[PDB]
Amino acid sequence: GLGPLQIWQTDFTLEPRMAPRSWLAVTVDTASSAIVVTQHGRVTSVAAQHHWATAIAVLGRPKAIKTDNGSCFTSKSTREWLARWGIAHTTGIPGNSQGQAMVERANRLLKDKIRVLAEGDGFMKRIPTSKQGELLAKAMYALNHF
Amino acid sequence: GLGPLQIWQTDFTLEPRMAPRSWLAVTVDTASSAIVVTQHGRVTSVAAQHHWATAIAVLGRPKAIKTDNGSCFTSKSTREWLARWGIAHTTGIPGNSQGQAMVERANRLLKDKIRVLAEGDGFMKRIPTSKQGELLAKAMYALNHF
Ligand SMILES: CC(=O)Nc1cc(S(=O)(=O)O)cc2cc(S(=O)(=O)O)cc(O)c12
Ligand SMILES: CC(=O)Nc1cc(S(=O)(=O)O)cc2cc(S(=O)(=O)O)cc(O)c12
């Protein structure tokens, strides 16, 4: 118990430099501050599930995931997928609090890093589609500091 | 799942105006922002347990309680009491984060309120021992806004 519980915060953020798959799903593991990010063409229940399938392979199974009241997060589909995995689903607290700052900071840091890396490579606008995956993996690696 | 999980933050804060029992155990329920506070002569494993016994009667059984690495919180006694109740015990996270701000804010608000109420009653220093209980209950009621 000496540590923090395994609770994630997940959201989607739009990054046109990564079009056609410009919807970035971002998960922060509040226990490690580790960040996992995947690319999606659309924000659907199935994109959220695919994102978490990847995050589970990378981080392990959390006890709970905190999102907002987004439809992709509150659909019957998504409710059932989390039940199948045994993962509790939670939401932001009270006390003039917003959704969840940590994953929001992560959105920003993530977008700044992609921008820095892309321009360094000579992409001032959209990143060529064949380069996007390696550049995203590089931004994730950097953010995770290791 | 539509709500936040039942996770508490608990700490002790020293309030000489409430001497001889000047150790205040404070629990914030992060799901409701409700505050429970009890008075203790000393900071021991048994004081923490007595405090939580009271907080359970008032708030219900939480899923987890977050404290610091205090001995009263990490003793075998306390570890066993939480196990007996089925309550997970957790700690502060990483990312340059401190222990737990919400319960720290609550310490301050609580001490300011006691001070305001005591002086209003004419107690500029220690609160007479026979008055302390009702004044503490009144400060808790106020803080919980209701
Ligand atoms: C378990 C726990 O303690 N969680 C938390 C601790 C603190 S803190 O201020 O005390 O650091 C703030 C929190 C803020 C939010 S949010 O609704 O704004 O997104 C959610 C939490 O879950 C928080
Ligand atoms: C479950 C959850 O999200 N918890 C939390 C959310 C956020 S927030 O910045 O995202 O609001 C901040 C937190 C800070 C701490 S602490 O180590 O500083 O005490 C602990 C938490 O548990 C927090």
Side-chain angles (χ1 to χ4, degrees), chain A residues 100-126:
Chain A
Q100 53 282 327
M102 264 177 79
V103 72
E104 260 111 60
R105 181 176 216 252
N107 292 334
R108 174 189 64 82
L109 289 173
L110 183 68
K111 276 136 106 212
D112 290 357
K113 181 53 70 182
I114 278 162
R115 177 190 48 86
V116 170
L117 297 177
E119 294 187 343
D121 277 349
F123 309 131
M124 304 297 133
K125 313 283 208 183
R126 200 182 60 88

Side-chain angles (χ1 to χ4, degrees), chain A residues 15-135:
Chain A
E15 177 43 82
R17 288 178 197 250
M18 291 284 182
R21 277 141 48 77
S22 35
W23 280 105
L24 304 182
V26 186
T27 279
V28 180
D29 180 349
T30 64
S32 65
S33 271
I35 286 143
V36 176
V37 53
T38 54
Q39 240 189 313
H40 306 280
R42 267 190 68 193
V43 183
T44 58
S45 286
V46 169
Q49 295 164 211
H50 286 0
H51 168 69
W52 286 323
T54 294
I56 287 165
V58 176
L59 308 174
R61 189 212 274 219
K63 301 283 170 17
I65 302 171
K66 197 201 265 213
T67 63
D68 57 43
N69 204 85
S71 66
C72 60
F73 297 131
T74 63
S75 75
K76 185 184 178 297
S77 186
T78 291
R79 285 180 35 243
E80 174 57 20
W81 193 94
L82 293 169
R84 176 168 14 258
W85 272 96
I87 301 175
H89 185 194
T90 188
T91 225
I93 55 166
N96 281 43
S97 298
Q98 291 178 24
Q100 53 282 327
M102 264 177 79
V103 72
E104 260 111 60
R105 181 176 216 252
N107 292 334
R108 174 189 64 82
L109 289 173
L110 183 68
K111 276 136 106 212
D112 290 357
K113 181 53 70 182
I114 278 162
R115 177 190 48 86
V116 170
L117 297 177
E119 294 187 343
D121 277 349
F123 309 131
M124 304 297 133
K125 313 283 208 183
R126 200 182 60 88
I127 293 139
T129 306
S130 54
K131 281 79 186 88
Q132 289 176 1
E134 289 205 20
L135 202 145

